[PDB]
Design a protein around this ligand. Structure first.
Ligand SMILES: O=CCCCC[C@@H]1SC[C@@H]2NC(=O)N[C@@H]21
Ligand SMILES: O=CCCCC[C@@H]1SC[C@@H]2NC(=O)N[C@@H]21
Lengths: 566, 177, 566
């Protein structure tokens, strides 16, 4: 009918239905939300600074961070003493190591935030980081995993949060075939929590297991020995394609200098006990002997160069690309996010978020009239086709079917998946249970777990209960996890668990007010005591923590990380 | 050769009425024009137009099988053959959005019945070609159901209407969407 | 509760629930059914005899077969003339070729039964067979496909039913890796239906295509040239690992003896034109030159011996096994089958049939309370575990789901499948259509076609319409098909098509009786004019035709045929 184009015009124009046009009006509601978000990011963006240069914050105005006041002078004294030795006490080794003008990720940050409670009731162990810093680094045109042991040995070298971080880094590198670089500085072991860190599985032995399984798959790895690595820490220099020992302060020992005493205590110099022995000794241990920190870092870079990965990365990830920005300003991402601590769940939207994040502000909807709860479709993220699952409302059987169908197509055509978690939302109606809802949930989870597609999840907010099993979860092998500040990970019910567990717990009929004070308030305190900031990341649950505004850059880092894969 | 093509194209409606270069018998042009008018009033394009709308401009096309079912069946009327201007479908290789694809379109000719022993064979030939060459298929579906007259010839046995369903699953096994 | 066994006793006893105890009472209803069956088998079992020794039935009492009287004297004269030549005119070559005490199948029989209508109105072409005889034969401990060209050349060598039979045999052999043996006697081609048999595809060229594709897969094939094979028939002796030419009457030609005349007509002896030339000619054509029929058959057997397949077959199919019979008498199979030509569908059962066929009369039911329409479960057939799908009633969505689940398990564990076809039975209710019944039917057909498991189907009765797409059909690659006498293969409706097509066909409101006489009676005649005996097998639709009583033996032949497969 008076309409005869050739699909384009209708396409390739600034007027295709594919795009999205949710324009906000900045009203009170927007302000209430936008403002809060701002109230939910300032310190997130801040604590980072405090742990960075940990314990030395000369401004002394860090009231925006709820961190307790710490003895700045002690940390400054320790840093001065350490830097007088001739080694750089910072993450400086990293940004010296990575090529200028390139990107970085800082995979796990704020690790071990106020984790352990000391004997002093008001004092926690001052683990500003997990004892290491981990991030994806691009060296000499080669993408690599960077792990650096921090010089914080006051509490002890490695904790249940340190070895877990190291093992997570090793698993990520092995999955993605990114070579690792380890910067080694250790105080040995922790002889206090040794039962928690040494024996059992997924412990310090699995590091040695991984450093051999990698070299089986011919994924070369490199370690730099800046200081002592004793107590089983001396095997990494031994199990290494290339290793670096600094001329003066680089030391490697299987038995400590105190250990020779009380067992043939003919004590001699710490150099002769296994440290950097530049005298043409009989031992052929340690590939590189470098006179200075810069010399060692330079030789590490030079060894990284001769791996032939530059051609493969350059072919797989195009270095010269034209950035395509979204149609709407990314600062608006905080506004559509609702507020917090609201008796009844507030309202929420997804279209706006996806239209703000994706390229050209576009989307490819599958069936949206049907199973209106769940959202699935294709997209574009900086030159790469992506699939997104974002959740909105209370799940039905049909939503599970649609999810299974989408995941089937994505696995069929080798399209990566992105997850945006939300509430559990399993209806409890009797008719729904009689309609085989459990079978359809199984249909969804089977497809989720069976998918060989790389998978990344990011918390939008309100991910509580067994609903994440429908979409995705840490136990379903997501190659990366990141989080927004307004996240709560809890039991099958965030608010309802309060009501349900109020009924069935040794309660007399009378004393109703005192009981709800003792029951409902207490369970609310329990189920929102956990949050994005503490229960997560600090314990390497969903290790990555980010800002809602800069999500697309992070996801693009992740996707470039997962295309060197076999 | 170059001409009959034109006649089956816009089949049965040749306003020039000078198609003596084609030995085709004179057909009731008014009936076909009436049918096409009624069909286009419905809101759907009665032609191969769906195809050249679907394929990118400036690109090529093949029209794999043409003149299909040319004067094939002899009707009860001795001087009349069944007016199957095409095989009931049109098949050609099409390049869509930079992607080469097989295009199969069911014609709206349902006067004789949807599918014949020449229609299912054309569809199956297209499916075999696509599977051999790993070109994805696009089917434009318009049907009058089945043909309950030659049903023994088209429904049972092998290489029939079931093999279409067989191929549409064997393709998705090989991940050829 | 006072019950503490160890599973057996409860098991390994003559009282396990696994078995089945449907005992008949031989009542009128049984008689009506049992008797009819008997009325449905006598001639089935008989025509076989008539085509066997075709056209020569000395009893002349073959009134039990509706076959028209034929000139017996002419056929006897032809057979006498042919046997005077020195070659055995019968299937005798086969049972001479196969080891004594072994089995045989006769894959396609009654082929080309009264197919073509001649110029004479009351006369059909006398193709007692398809011109060939095909059956699975076990030679020298090696299972092989046997194809023998009958000496019936009165109508012409090969027909649209002959080449289809040959190609079906070749496809079966290639799928099952059974070597073929061809017994070649030809009158050349048929220059009357040549357009129907020579050009196009799936024709005489595909025989030559298959005889080369087999030798690519190293599946050796053997041909015996008893008489002339001209008109493209001379390539099979040329395309053969081993070929046999009889000393006197074995001839091979690319150009006929009449063909030399009118084109340099220097006629010479038919021996010199390409026949058996035992004079040490320059041609190295034809491996074996045998003085007698027995000598040629013996050399064929000797060549078959040196293939090394005996060890592989003996390992795969155990030669020394203990037969386990069912608990109930197989003669009762005809009784549970209802009668025929009944206005409204009669009643039917399945349990009894499966309990009569399987080993030990046992079964392994999946969910039978749910989707009570369709039947699926495991079984035992002569030492081999089997899966059976037998249909009973009108299909639902849940029946399709159960079928898909069963086929999934069977493919997962590599269990063969058996099909017992029945009515279409797709409900037309609006609520059922609104419940996504089409999606569930697609779910079923997808699993049916995708299954790599060997598949065999046998017609129980009433297989009409698109319902077979749910279970299985010829277009879904069943490696064998067999049929019972009471079978009807028709449009989506056997009885209802009459009612529906009565309404919508140029009918005036009045003249109702004359119209139903002209409409309903006519469509009934059309939709039951087709049947098991004519429309099937004779046209190689479901090529195998059997008796209901001897089904388990046939299915056991089929399963042993499908374990030499790769
Ligand atoms: O429309 C009313 C039904 C609401 C169901 C909410 C589901 S039921 C289980 C889960 N726990 C909750 O508190 N909400 C979800
Ligand atoms: O109970 C009433 C429903 C009857 C369904 C009859 C089924 S629907 C498809 C098939 N075609 C027929 O003519 N009858 C069956």
């Amino acid at each position: 009918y008076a309409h005869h184009p050739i699909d384009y015009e209708r396409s390739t124009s600034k007027s295709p239905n594919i795009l999205r046009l949710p324009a906000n009006t900045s009203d009170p509601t927007y302000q209430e939300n936008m403002a809060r978000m701002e109230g939910l990011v300032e310190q997130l963006r801040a604590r980072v600074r405090y742990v960075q240069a940990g314990g030395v914050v000369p401004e002394e105005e860090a009231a925006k961070a709820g961190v307790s006041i710490s003895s700045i002078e002690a940390d400054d004294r320790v840093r001065k003493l350490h830097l007088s030795r001739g080694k750089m006490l910072a993450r400086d080794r990293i940004e010296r190591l990575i090529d200028p003008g390139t990107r970085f990720l800082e995979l796990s940050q704020l690790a071990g935030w106020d984790l352990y409670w000391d004997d002093k009731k008001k004092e926690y162990e001052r683990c500003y980081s997990g004892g290491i810093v981990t991030g994806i680094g691009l060296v000499n045109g080669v993408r690599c995993m960077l792990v650096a042991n921090d010089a914080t040995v006051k509490g002890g070298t490695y904790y249940p949060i340190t070895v877990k971080k190291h093992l997570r880094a090793q698993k990520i590198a092995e999955q993605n075939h990114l070579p690792c670089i380890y910067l080694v500085d250790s105080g040995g072991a922790n002889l206090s929590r040794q039962d928690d860190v040494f024996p059992d599985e997924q412990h310090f032995g699995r590091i040695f297991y991984n450093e051999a399984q990698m070299s089986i798959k011919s994924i070369s790895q490199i370690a730099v020995v800046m200081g002592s690595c004793t107590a089983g820490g001396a095997y990494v220099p031994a199990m290494a394609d290339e290793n670096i020992i600094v001329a003066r302060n680089g030391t490697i020992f299987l038995g400590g200098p105190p250990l020779v005493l009380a067992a043939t205590g003919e004590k001699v110099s710490s150099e002769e006990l296994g440290g950097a022995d530049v005298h043409c000794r009989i031992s052929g241990v340690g590939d590189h002997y470098a006179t200075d920190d810069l010399h060692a870092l330079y030789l590490a870079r030079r060894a990284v160069a001769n791996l032939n990965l530059k051609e493969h990365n350059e072919a797989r990830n195009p270095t010269d690309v034209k950035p395509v920005p979204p149609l709407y300003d990314p600062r608006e991402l905080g506004g559509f996010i609702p507020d917090m601590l609201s008796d009844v769940v507030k309202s929420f939207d997804v279209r706006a978020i996806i239209a703000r994040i994706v390229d050209g502000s576009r989307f490819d909807e599958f069936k949206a009239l049907y199973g209106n709860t769940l959202v699935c479709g294709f997209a574009r993220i900086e030159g790469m086709q992506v699939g997104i699952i974002a959740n909105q409302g209370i799940l039905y059987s049909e939503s599970a079917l649609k999810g299974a169908h989408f995941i089937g197509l994505c696995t069929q055509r080798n399209v990566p998946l992105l997850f945006l978690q939300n509430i559990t939302g399993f209806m409890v109606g009797k008719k729904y249970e009689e309609g085989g809802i459990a079978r359809n949930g199984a249909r969804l989870v089977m497809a989720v777990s069976s998918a060989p597609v790389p998978k990344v999840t990011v918390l939008i907010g309100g991910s509580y209960g067994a609903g994440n099993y429908g979409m995705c979860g840490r136990a379903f092998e997501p190659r990366f996890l990141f989080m927004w500040p307004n996240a709560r990970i809890s039991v099958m019910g965030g608010t309802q668990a309060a009501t349900v567990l109020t009924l069935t717990n040794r309660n007399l009929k009378n004393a109703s007010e005192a009981e709800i004070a003792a029951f409902k308030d207490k369970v609310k305190k329990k189920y929102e005591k956990e949050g994005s900031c503490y229960y997560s990341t600090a314990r390497l649950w969903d290790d990555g923590v980010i800002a809602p505004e800069d999500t697309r850059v992070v996801v693009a880092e992740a996707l470039r990380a997962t295309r060197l894969a076999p």
